[PDB]
């Protein structure tokens, strides 16, 4: 049985669905192990490295040979004619207001299985992509403000005086938000931070962080005016509340963006939801009223080689619960992300 | 006494010599101030804030009311033809190759002092431009290296596994290369860092980073995700630290940060004002390193220039480089 690892086509996707590691794991599992020329070069694997790992290389052509297609992206609609019926594909499908395609998919007579449908309870940790990705956006949004700010993060004290630690704000404390609270305090910053759950408290504050909240319809109200005046204090805001399947939360109007001091900078990890921030523009960084409005795409391929090294590493762990190659559409897994099969939209 | 504050003419100088502070300073030394329009602007210092720490806002027109014109980067031919005969000018002069324009201000009247030749005195450290850059350079060194790599600094554990901390060298470990340290450690990297100076062997265990000390280094090198270069002599070229054959034997992926670039560098092929991909390595190699945080760098030149300037209400010898009409550096 033949894996085949594609290179992506998206202009923006660095990323790739194997690891070295990752493909000395599908070569244990007894599969034929293929990949397409250049896949892992945005996330700096060069072929040399796979050929090591056990695999060869091959190119678009293999694809229509595979049993298996692991990548990233949902196969656009030129992509999917180059696989063969009955194949399966695994991978970040994105399948929410995207039925057309998945028409297309079982159309083409493909078993597909969509990764962020995974079940998310603590037993599955390890196969897990929305969290993998977002643990890697959190800490990239933290490097990424520092980049676009004027001023440095760590309070500094020199002969010259002393520069006072960047005051970072992070909205939304699930994987991401732990991760850019624990990514902003290293590089020394007075950090808080807040989350619509209560019980998050306890875990910003055992990061050393300032959960910040009113402490007591009636409360969401005083909430938000605890915030925006919490706000306008702030040197850097990273927003953090994607919700996938749904639109992303406005938690931030350019009105509390316009209560901020020229310098600040705020980083939008929802923009591709429509953002949490209002001025927030896909893919990039804009300026209003000296602040700076960050809303990069697909944040986690910023950091491409790790990105890609977790992500290979969900894929054929999940791909193992399916082992030869026993498919069966009743598993519990299967069921849950099992999107196509058989000609038939599952 | 006028002093006016400059509007830096450069497309890559966001940094102003005048701060909300340093104005206040200035007033309070006797100083009547005068901020150029938008003056601030790269440093996040709106006019408006500039005025309501007591200075004028005005325009170019207006350096020549001015008996003090305090500015980052040396006056342009044009500029100077806008200063008065008499007026004093303090600034980054970068006079090492620009003995023509040295000339052209002592032509035009004017008593010019360059800040980077402060004498690295314990006494004038208030005032050290080169260690007050350096010093934030050294920090944004680290923050571009982690921009351009394309994996995690920190080792960072995720329910999908680890990913390893990156392996960071540090070669100088002077102001630059000791932030540089500093900061690599504390997004938690693997550091390491190398010196001349068997001294610095102290300081840099302290930061917690290990000290290494031609062909050890190669072969170092050779084991790193990123590397950084410090070594920068004012006036004098940069040594070669790392070659194109040390760079063809790191991992594809692997990204170095010249400091130096902008006196031939310490890395081969290093390119100034740009980050070159050769190899799948990566070498960046940004002018202004300490402009990338301007804000936070005006903030510490700007009162650097107003502690000197109390002086002289030994320094100005080392300094002074035009007056009265001659060039009265002996240096030149």
Do not use: C, W
């Not at 049985?1 to 794991?25: H, L, M, Q, T, Y």
């Not at 082992?323 to 058989?342: I, R, S, W």
Request: proline share 3%.
């Amino acid at each position: 049985e033949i894996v085949f690892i594609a290179k992506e086509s998206d202009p923006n996707e660095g990323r790739v669905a194997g690891s070295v590691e990752s493909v000395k794991k599908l070569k244990s599992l007894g599969f034929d192990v293929v990949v397409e020329a250049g896949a892992g070069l945005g996330s700096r694997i060069p072929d040399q490295e796979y050929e090591k790992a056990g695999a060869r290389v091959g190119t678009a052509a293999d694809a229509k040979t595979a049993d298996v297609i692991l990548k990233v992206r949902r196969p656009s609609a030129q992509e999917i004619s180059g696989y063969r019926s009955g194949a399966v594909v695994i991978a970040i499908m994105d399948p929410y207001g995207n039925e057309e395609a998945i028409s297309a998919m079982a159309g083409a007579g493909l078993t597909t299985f969509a990764m962020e449908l995974m079940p998310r309870i603590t037993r599955a940790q390890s196969m897990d992509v929305l969290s993998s990705q977002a643990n890697l956006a959190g800490y990239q949004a933290v490097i990424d403000a520092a980049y676009e700010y004027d001023r440095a993060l760590p309070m500094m004290m020199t002969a010259a005086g002393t520069v006072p630690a960047a005051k970072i704000f992070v909205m939304g404390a699930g994987v991401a938000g732990l991760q850019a609270i624990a990514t902003a305090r290293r590089l020394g910053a007075v950090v808080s931070a807040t989350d619509v759950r209560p019980a998050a408290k306890e875990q910003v504050a055992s990061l050393g962080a300032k959960f910040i909240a009113v402490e007591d319809g009636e409360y969401q109200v005083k909430q938000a005016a605890l915030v925006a005046e919490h706000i306008a204090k702030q040197d850097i805001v990273i927003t953090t509340a994607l919700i996938p399947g749904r639109p992303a939360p406005r938690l931030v109007t350019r009105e509390m963006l316009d209560s901020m001091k020229p310098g600040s900078v705020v980083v939008d990890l929802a923009v591709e939801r429509g953002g949490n921030i209002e001025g927030a523009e896909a893919g990039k960084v804009t300026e209003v009223g000296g602040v700076r409005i960050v809303g990069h795409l697909n944040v986690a391929g910023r950091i491409a080689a790790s990105a890609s090294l977790l992500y290979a590493k969900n894929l054929v762990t999940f791909l193992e619960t399916m082992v030869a190659l026993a498919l069966n559409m009743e598993d519990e897994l299967v069921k849950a992300t099992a999107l196509t099969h058989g000609g038939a939209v599952v």
